[PDB]
Design a protein around this ligand. Structure first.
Ligand SMILES: Nc1nc2c(ncn2[C@@H]2O[C@H](COP(=O)(O)OP(=O)(O)OP(=O)(O)O)[C@@H](O)[C@H]2O)c(=O)[nH]1
Ligand SMILES: Nc1ncnc2c1ncn2[C@@H]1O[C@H](COP(=O)(O)OP(=O)(O)CP(=O)(O)O)[C@@H](O)[C@H]1O
Ligand SMILES: Nc1nc2c(ncn2[C@@H]2O[C@H](COP(=O)(O)OP(=O)(O)O)[C@@H](O)[C@H]2O)c(=O)[nH]1
Ligand SMILES: [Ca+2]
Ligand SMILES: [Mg+2]
Ligand SMILES: [Mg+2]
Ligand SMILES: [Mg+2]
Lengths: 331, 54, 430, 437
């Protein structure tokens, strides 16, 4: 019998994993503070990594990578890409970005901003978000830690609707640091026509609240890959694989292979896996850009069952054998 | 990768290499604590031998 | 050279007490005449713990035999290891206690207790560094129960900084001698909770059921019951009698086993369970020892460990075996049943291994547990006690010796408090 | 030349001391007799090895060491062992009954009765020193003597020898070989009382060296003999600079200067390689690059933690065997590009290096194989705070229920000292997090 503990109740993903494990009959859930566990579905913050792997007779596994936050935080991601020679200042799939503190790269952002105006100069400030061409306005919004990023003025627009979207990709990194990309991705779409002058933010929460047109084109403003691929064949005479996914699979690898030496648990006294959520924008030219990485991502409703079962098969059952939906991004 | 202060001898040698630059209680007080603990012991034992005497 | 002074009081105390010395004398290679004839230096490296040395290199048990009637002590002196005991350490009266706690504690035993303390004192004065005392007795009778707890209270007065250990036999209607045993036991427990550091709860209910159900003895005698006790006593004193790291003395054992002063009632276990002359030929595998030592059917106290939680545990393995395998199997028990071990005492299971096995076995394991399930034992005695006391039945035997009903009320209350204190930590969480 | 006095306390300290001095004697060519043929200066010497050994008119070399234990069994083995002629009786001090794994019993009860004797026996070694520079104290966190009596001794040594430095070699408790449930209590208690009196303390987690013995020496169930033989190699590497000609860490003061910017943060993480089984028939000797790279693997650390998720304040590389600077720098250069090594902003990113051409000496019939080169890395990293966190957690679990507390109170201690010591450990964890995050 294997044993595990749950220390993040607000996790929709691992609540399903927990259920699936118990359903095997070969996994027993302990109290949260019982140290004699084989698996830990840890909390989102201040996870005690220092207390893992110090239990004789137990192989201990946790569903998070210590140090992975460097990829999943806005400001940290910027600093990571700029200062990492594997990614470098000359990185062609990450928008121009700068880190700013309220009340730092303020001097450097303005230095490049003045270049833009003489002679498109729209940006975006992320912590509530504010899109504006006025630099003086953005800096005010921050003061009353943020990142200022180049706003993609020319996004790929879906027809009918003339509406923008972003792509969420779910990635699973096991204990051997095998990069697994989930077959199914999702397009969080805007139900509003993209206005060059609620329609700019593809956030599912913002869409449900401020959009009259929520859910007309597709279920819950979520277009999946089978449909999106079909649209791409009919409208632009290409495939999702060629036009977009090659770039996605490239970005996912580059980021995770860059940070691997810092977080790998290959020779550690405990093992780690983690589920990541990569968010991408694509422009008119079918060029893929990376927005952010999510360390604790939820999943699309109809994809929970298949994805969560994959986490058990690949990340958990691999370490704890009982008695493919993933694409392996080879290094 | 600057090597500095290289010292050598028949037994061996040592050196430093820099990759990047930067960017109480008195004896009296002890004797009291030990004695304060000794009295607390003697008090507890006294209560015991008192209880047993009853 | 940390000496232990052994005391045995009453019929039961001297029966088991005599068997204990027979067993360990054999393990240490001491013959009935007190001469050593062993083949290992491990046998004598800590012999001084239980034996005194005389001229001619004779080894004499540091034991004091007490009773209020000469019956059992005449049987011991005529027993196989009768000659081994120091003749002057035999201290007895003639009146008997008539299964009356009041007689042993207040009247008959009071007349004899000073003579015993004179022998205890002479033994203690000879000690290089006295650890403390171990007492063997039953709680259901009069002498061992009444005078035994009287001796304990007096020994504590003269030796307040020494450890007081006891092997206390609990009364069961399955092996009942009289109807007043619940009175004698409750009165005794009231004393043990206050004046002992360590008490091994040997339950006659458990001993009988083992003999009947497991060993398939249709008509168990006291000899069959004592085969199990002497085996348990040999086991739980192994760490004290041979070179070892864990629980090597009475104080270190107490520090490891007793998180709270009143909760010092241990539940002993043993594997493999054998009957006298069974002489089984197949040694148990380390996995087999481990599963059986923790089994309810191997517990010498009639309590279901799954009805409580372990505060602390001490496991002792005896014989030539893989220490690696012992560690793996002990870790396996804790990890497979982690819910039965309290989480607020980390690493509360300590394991020892001794190369010398008990006689007749290649492999054996002894279990010592401080479980909250032991409350079932005190609940049982409390039920039996209250059943009579609500009608004040048979109290005249006690009030005739000067006792008052209040003293019964207090003793009942303190034992019920003990039960509720175990239940408190059985529900506690981290 | 400035003398160093070693103080071995409790079972762990004494038995480890035995392994070390056995190893020192092999490295210096001293016999159990106490004679040292190579030493031509009879009756006295100003040499480097005289830091640890004094000389008699007859030419005997005597460890400047005092063994103390509140129970005579362990020290009695030294009195009757192979190196009985090495020490003189006044160096070996024994009581009658131990501290029963109780800090309070070792500190307050039994400590009070022997503290003046030990100090007087230490005073007699100090009187034979022309320039005593300080003390090396070996003990355990878990034992009652090792924890309780040590903290009392460290308090008094700061009174009697205020100018002198004091280094610790502490054994951190591990369930796989621990003999008490209350070892977390004793640890926090002795750490709290000793903190201000120790200048530099090298922790050794029994868990780490236990697994190293299983993994690399192929030992199924390590004994204290196995553990101590490996520990002594680490201690020997650390103290070699005091016993041999060199220019790095030549006095106890330099340990603090090189490894301890902040006084409270004085617990350097030790890492050692290579550890090779003497039973391996065929073995490929590892290069400078291979053993140096091994110093950044948690599997080789004296305490299992992750320096990748902390920051460095200092780093010392102590080599023994066939090593030259050029190969070290080449190895460091390669490693810096491959590994995560971040120092604090207010410290130089660099390494102090020491090479002793003599390869590591191994006890004949031991578990370790002879190697042509080995290294011990001393790095003050904040990641070692993971050990305090593990320990403080176990402490909090038991103390919330006041489990076993009565044993301490019973010996005269006050329950307030438990929380006082825990508060000090809470502050310490807070100091580490500020410096390293
Ligand atoms: N590495 C190593 N650890 C040891 C050794 N001996 C004991 N220990 C550890 O020390 C802890 C217990 O402290 P001890 O040194 O044995 O006890 P003590 O200092 O003599 O204190 P008391 O016995 O209470 O008087 C346990 O956690 C052991 O694992 C040893 O020889 N080597
Ligand atoms: N640089 C950029 N260029 C163009 N559009 C952008 C952009 N940065 C953000 N957006 C849009 O704004 C939305 C804000 O999402 P962001 O991911 O930035 O905050 P969040 O982290 O609170 C949402 P989630 O975690 O669900 O992805 C994006 O989904 C995208 O639609
Ligand atoms: N195991 C065991 N129990 C006994 C023996 N003799 C008596 N008892 C138990 O002890 C209780 C009676 O106490 P007893 O020893 O006769 O009283 P005392 O001699 O007057 O102190 C009863 O509950 C019996 O079950 C014995 O030889 N072995
Ligand atoms: Ca000389
Ligand atoms: Mg986000
Ligand atoms: Mg009878
Ligand atoms: Mg000791």
């Amino acid at each position: 019998m294997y044993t595990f503990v749950v220390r993040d109740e607000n996790s929709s993903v691992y609540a399903e994993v927990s259920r699936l494990l118990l359903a095997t009959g070969q996994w027993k859930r302990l109290r949260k503070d019982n140290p004699r566990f084989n698996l830990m579905l840890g909390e989102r913050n201040r996870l005690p990594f220092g207390r893992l792997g110090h239990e004789p007779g137990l192989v201990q596994l946790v569903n998070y990578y210590r140090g992975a936050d460097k990829l999943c935080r806005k400001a940290s991601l910027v600093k990571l890409i700029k200062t990492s020679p594997e990614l470098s200042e000359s990185c062609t799939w990450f928008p121009e970005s700068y880190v700013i503190y309220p009340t730092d790269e303020r001097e450097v952002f303005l230095a490049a901003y003045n270049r833009r105006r003489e002679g498109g100069n729209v940006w975006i400030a992320k912590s509530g978000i504010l899109i504006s061409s006025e630099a003086s306005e953005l800096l005010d919004f921050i003061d009353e830690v943020h990142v200022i990023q180049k706003y993609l003025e020319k996004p790929l627009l879906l027809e009918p609707g003339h509406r923008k979207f972003d792509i969420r990709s779910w990635v699973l990194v096991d204990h051997l640091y095998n990069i697994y990309l989930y077959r199914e991705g999702v397009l969080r779409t805007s139900s509003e026509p993209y206005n060059s002058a609620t329609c700019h933010l593809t956030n599912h929460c913002i869409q449900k609240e401020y959009s009259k047109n929520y859910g007309r084109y597709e279920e819950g403003n979520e277009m999946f890959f089978e449909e999106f691929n079909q649209y791409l064949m009919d409208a632009l005479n290409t495939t999702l694989e060629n036009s977009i996914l090659l770039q996605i699979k490239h970005i996912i690898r580059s980021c995770l292979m860059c940070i691997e030496p810092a977080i790998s648990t290959k020779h550690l006294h405990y093992q780690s896996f983690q589920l990541f959520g990569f968010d991408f924008m694509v422009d008119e030219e079918l060029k893929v850009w990376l927005i952010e990485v999510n360390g604790a991502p939820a999943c699309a409703q109809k994809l929970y069952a298949e994805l969560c079962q994959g986490i058990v098969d690949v990340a958990i059952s691999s370490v704890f054998p009982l008695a493919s939906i993933f694409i392996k991004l080879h290094h | 990768m600057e090597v500095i202060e290289l010292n050598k001898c028949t037994s061996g040698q040592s050196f430093e290499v820099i990759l990047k630059p930067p960017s109480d209680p008195s004896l009296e007080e002890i004797q009291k604590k030990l004695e304060a603990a000794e009295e607390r012991r003697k008090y507890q034992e006294a209560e015991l031998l008192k209880h047993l005497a009853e | 050279m940390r000496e232990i002074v052994h005391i045995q009081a009453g019929q039961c105390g001297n029966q088991i007490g005599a068997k204990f010395w027979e067993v360990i004398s054999d393990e240490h290679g001491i013959d009935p005449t007190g001469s050593y004839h062993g083949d290992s230096d491990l046998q004598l490296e800590r012999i001084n713990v239980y034996y005194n040395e005389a001229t001619g290199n004779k080894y004499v048990p540091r034991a004091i035999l007490v009773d209020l009637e000469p019956g059992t002590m005449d049987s011991v002196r005529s027993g196989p290891f009768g000659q081994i005991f120091r003749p002057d350490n035999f201290v007895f009266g003639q009146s008997g206690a008539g299964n009356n706690w009041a007689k042993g504690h207040y009247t008959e035993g009071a007349e004899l207790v000073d003579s015993v303390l004179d022998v205890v004192r002479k033994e203690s004065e000879s000690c290089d560094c006295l650890q403390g005392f171990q007492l063997t007795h039953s709680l259901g009778g009069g002498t061992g129960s009444g005078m035994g707890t009287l001796l304990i209270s007096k020994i504590r007065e003269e030796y307040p900084d020494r450890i007081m250990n006891t092997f206390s036999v609990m009364p069961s209607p399955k092996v009942s001698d009289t109807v007043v045993e619940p009175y004698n036991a409750t009165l005794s427990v009231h004393q043990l909770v206050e004046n002992t550091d360590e008490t091994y709860c040997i339950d006659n209910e458990a001993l009988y059921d083992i003999c009947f159900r497991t060993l398939k003895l249709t008509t168990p005698t006291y000899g069959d019951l004592n085969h199990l006790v002497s085996a348990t006593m040999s086991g739980v004193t192994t760490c004290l009698r041979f070179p070892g790291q864990l629980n090597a003395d009475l104080r270190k054992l107490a520090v490891n086993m007793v998180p709270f002063p009143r909760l010092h009632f241990f539940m002993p276990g043993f594997a493999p369970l054998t009957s006298r002359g069974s002489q089984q030929y197949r040694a148990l595998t380390v996995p087999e020892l481990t599963q059986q030592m923790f089994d309810s059917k191997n517990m010498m106290a009639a309590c279901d460990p799954r009805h409580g939680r372990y505060l602390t545990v001490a496991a002792i393995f005896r014989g030539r075996m893989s220490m690696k395998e012992v560690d793996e199997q002990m870790l396996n028990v804790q990890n497979k049943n982690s819910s039965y071990f309290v989480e607020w005492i980390p690493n509360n299971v300590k394991t020892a291994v001794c190369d010398i096995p008990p006689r007749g076995l290649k492999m054996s394991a002894t279990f010592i547990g401080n479980s909250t399930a032991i409350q079932e034992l005190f609940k049982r005695i409390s039920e039996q006690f209250t059943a009579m006391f609500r009608r004040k039945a048979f109290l005249h035997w006690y009030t005739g010796e000067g006792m008052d009903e209040m003293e019964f009320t207090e003793a009942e209350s303190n034992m019920n408090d003990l039960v509720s204190e175990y239940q408190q930590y059985q529900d506690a969480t981290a | 030349m400035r003398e160093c006095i070693s103080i071995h306390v409790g079972q762990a300290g004494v038995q480890i001391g035995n392994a070390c001095w056995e190893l020192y004697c092999l490295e210096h060519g001293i016999q159990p007799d106490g004679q040292m043929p190579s030493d031509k200066t009879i009756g006295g010497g100003d040499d480097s090895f005289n830091t640890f050994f004094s000389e008699t008119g007859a030419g005997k070399h005597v460890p400047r060491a005092v063994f103390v234990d509140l129970e005579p069994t362990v020290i009695d083995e030294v009195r009757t062992g192979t190196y009985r002629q090495l020490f003189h009786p006044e160096q070996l001090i024994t009581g009658k009954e131990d501290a029963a794994n109780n800090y309070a019993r070792g500190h307050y009860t039994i400590g009070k009765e022997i503290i003046d004797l030990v100090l007087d026996r230490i005073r007699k070694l100090a009187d034979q020193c022309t320039g005593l520079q300080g003390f090396l104290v070996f003990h355990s966190f878990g034992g009652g003597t090792g924890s309780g009596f040590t903290s009392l001794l460290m308090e008094r040594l700061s009174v009697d020898y205020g100018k002198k430095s004091k280094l610790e070699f502490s054994i951190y408790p591990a369930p796989q070989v621990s003999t008490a449930v209350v070892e977390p209590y004793n640890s926090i208690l002795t750490t709290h009382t000793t903190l201000e009196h120790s200048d530099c303390a090298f922790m050794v987690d029994n868990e780490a060296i236990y697994d190293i013995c299983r993994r690399n020496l192929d030992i199924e169930r390590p004994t204290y003999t196995n553990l101590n033989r490996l520990i002594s190699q680490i201690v020997s590497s650390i103290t070699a600079s005091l016993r041999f000609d060199g220019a790095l860490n030549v006095d106890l003061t330099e340990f603090q200067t090189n490894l301890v910017p902040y006084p409270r943060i004085h617990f350097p993480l030790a890492t050692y390689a290579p550890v090779i089984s003497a039973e391996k028939a065929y073995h490929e000797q590892l290069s400078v690059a291979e053993i140096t790279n091994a110093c950044f693997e948690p599997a080789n650390q004296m305490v299992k933690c992750d320096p990748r998720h902390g920051k460095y304040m200092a780093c010392c590389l102590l080599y023994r065997g066939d090593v030259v600077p050029k190969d070290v720098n080449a190895a460091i250069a390669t490693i810096k590009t491959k590994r995560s090594i971040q120092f604090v902003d207010w410290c130089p990113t660099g390494f102090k290096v020491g090479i002793n051409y003599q390869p590591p000496t191994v006890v004949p019939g031991g578990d370790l194989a002879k190697v042509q080169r080995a290294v011990c890395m001393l790095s003050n990293t904040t990641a070692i705070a993971e050990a305090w966190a593990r320990l403080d957690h176990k402490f909090d679990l038991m103390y919330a229920k006041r489990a076993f507390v009565h044993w301490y109170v019973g010996e005269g201690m006050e329950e307030g000292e438990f929380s006082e010591a825990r508060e000090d450990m809470a502050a310490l964890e807070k100091d580490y997090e500020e410096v390293g995050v």
